[PDB]
Design a protein around this nucleic acid. Structure first.
Ligand SMILES: [Mn+2]
Ligand SMILES: [Mn+2]
Ligand SMILES: [Mn+2]
Length: 430
DNA sequence: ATTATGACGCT
DNA sequence: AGCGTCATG
């Protein structure tokens, strides 16, 4: 009762750019705006592999991981933009630079955690307390929440999307106790006001639209963000969790979409997040380990404590290329040439990073995949990264992997390599 | 022949 | 340190 911690001590938002790489390309080329369009890597094999899809194209069933030729079967008028190719490989610099644009705007409102190229968590707890003290106890107008959905509302005793959104928002605001600076629902509402402002700033200053979730923790904020896309934000209150989770497939919660979530389903004989509440913490720890078990016990009640880490920059800077089927690397000259291509891209990105961010990487990780291996990485080896020089990094990577060539001939490489990966890690301030 | 990233947990 | 999992623009 009075000592049951309810995990309502923070306001956390997740901001995620809508179909991000597509928006980057649509900003650059107005002919692609408000069209079914997708972003592809490469072109020769099956028209290229789609990695981002505008919402107009999604309506035709176009998805990521689809070959462009197949997408064109679903959507003959689909427009395509191709990722830049540099040194023989896809180069994602344009999207990384656009990401920095957005992250720098978000950082004006609060410290952020970069979770991906297109998304960041925000801890708004302090900004909410400030805005509440500024509000002097006056209530929150629906006009301050023009794109906000309140999950679970309207309910109880209009057939248009926007009409329903406004009905739910009015029910929410009507029930608010705007005199209590410690009410979690009020705190979330003010958080949503701030996120409206943040999203407006992003769109005004970049042209990019985003969606967002506002809740008491990272998992609920991410889940909330997905509920009303594109270009909308969703507030998931603590009180909304029992109904929300009662029909929520376990795989929808971040970290449960793979083998662990499948094992929760199979071992416990359940389907939905809410069904987890019927197990004790010890039962869940017995099946899934002490850490997972405690996390599941709290998560299915809407409670999670993972902090928004103060980190706007990536921890690693890496370069990767697959060599599938008949293009696998089977000679030493080939392996060396591609290691050099990767290392040259890595050098360029590292040198820019050192100038921008006042840090230097100190470890080089070299990863390969060998033909016949079912795993995505067949071997990982680290060595020292003491100089931002591509020829040195590629020679070092070759040295750490050369013992993998099972061939007796040193000119040939067997079995051929289907993946090279160079990653710079362990940054230090400089 | 999804491909190219990047974070994090385990031992 | 090296491996596996989870994520999916
Ligand atoms: Mn996105
Ligand atoms: Mn995202
Ligand atoms: Mn996505």
């Amino acid at each position: 009762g009075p000592h049951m911690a309810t995990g309502q001590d923070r306001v956390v938002a997740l901001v995620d750019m809508d179909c991000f790489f597509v928006q980057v390309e649509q900003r650059q080329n107005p002919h692609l705006r408000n069209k079914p369009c997708a972003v592809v890597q490469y072109k020769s094999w099956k028209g290229g592999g789609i990695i981002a899809v505008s919402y107009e194209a999604r309506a035709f069933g176009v998805t990521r991981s689809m070959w462009a030729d197949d997408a064109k079967k679903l959507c003959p008028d689909l427009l395509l933009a191709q990722v830049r190719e540099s040194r023989g490989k896809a180069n994602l610099t344009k999207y990384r630079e656009a990401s920095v644009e957005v992250m720098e705007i978000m950082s004006r409102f609060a410290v952020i955690e970069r979770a991906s190229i297109d998304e960041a968590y925000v801890d708004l707890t302090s900004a909410v307390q400030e805005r509440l003290q500024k509000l002097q106890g006056q209530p929150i107008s629906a006009d301050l929440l023009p794109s906000t959905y309140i999950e679970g509302l309207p309910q109880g005793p209009t057939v248009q999307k926007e009409g329903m959104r406004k009905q739910g928002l009015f029910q929410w605001l009507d029930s608010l106790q705007i005199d209590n600076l410690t009410s979690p629902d009020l705190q979330l509402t003010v958080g949503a006001v701030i996120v409206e402002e943040m999203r407006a700033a992003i769109e005004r200053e970049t042209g990019f639209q985003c969606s967002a979730g506002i809740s008491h923790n990272k998992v609920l904020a991410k889940l909330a963000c997905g509920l009303n896309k594109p270009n909308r934000q969703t507030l998931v209150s603590h009180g909304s969790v029992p109904q929300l989770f009662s029909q929520m497939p376990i795989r929808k919660i971040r970290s449960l979409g793979g083998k662990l979530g499948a094992s929760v389903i199979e071992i416990l004989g359940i389907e939905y997040m809410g069904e987890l509440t019927q197990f004790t913490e010890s039962q869940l720890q017995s099946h899934f380990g002490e850490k997972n078990g405690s996390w599941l016990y709290a998560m299915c009640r809407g409670i999670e404590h993972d902090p928004v880490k103060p980190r706007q920059l990536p921890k690693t800077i890496g370069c990767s290329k697959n060599f599938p089927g008949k293009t696998a690397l089977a000679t030493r000259e080939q392996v060396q040439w591609w290691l050099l291509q990767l290392a040259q891209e890595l050098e360029e990105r590292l040198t820019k990073d050192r100038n921008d961010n006042d840090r230097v990487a100190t470890q080089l990780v070299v990863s390969i995949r060998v033909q016949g291996d079912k795993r995505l990485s067949s071997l990982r080896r680290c060595c020292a990264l003491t100089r931002y020089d591509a020829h040195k990094m590629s020679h070092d990577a070759f040295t750490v992997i050369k013992n993998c060539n099972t061939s007796g001939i040193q000119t040939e490489w067997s079995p051929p390599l289907t993946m090279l990966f160079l990653c710079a890690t362990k940054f230090s301030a400089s």
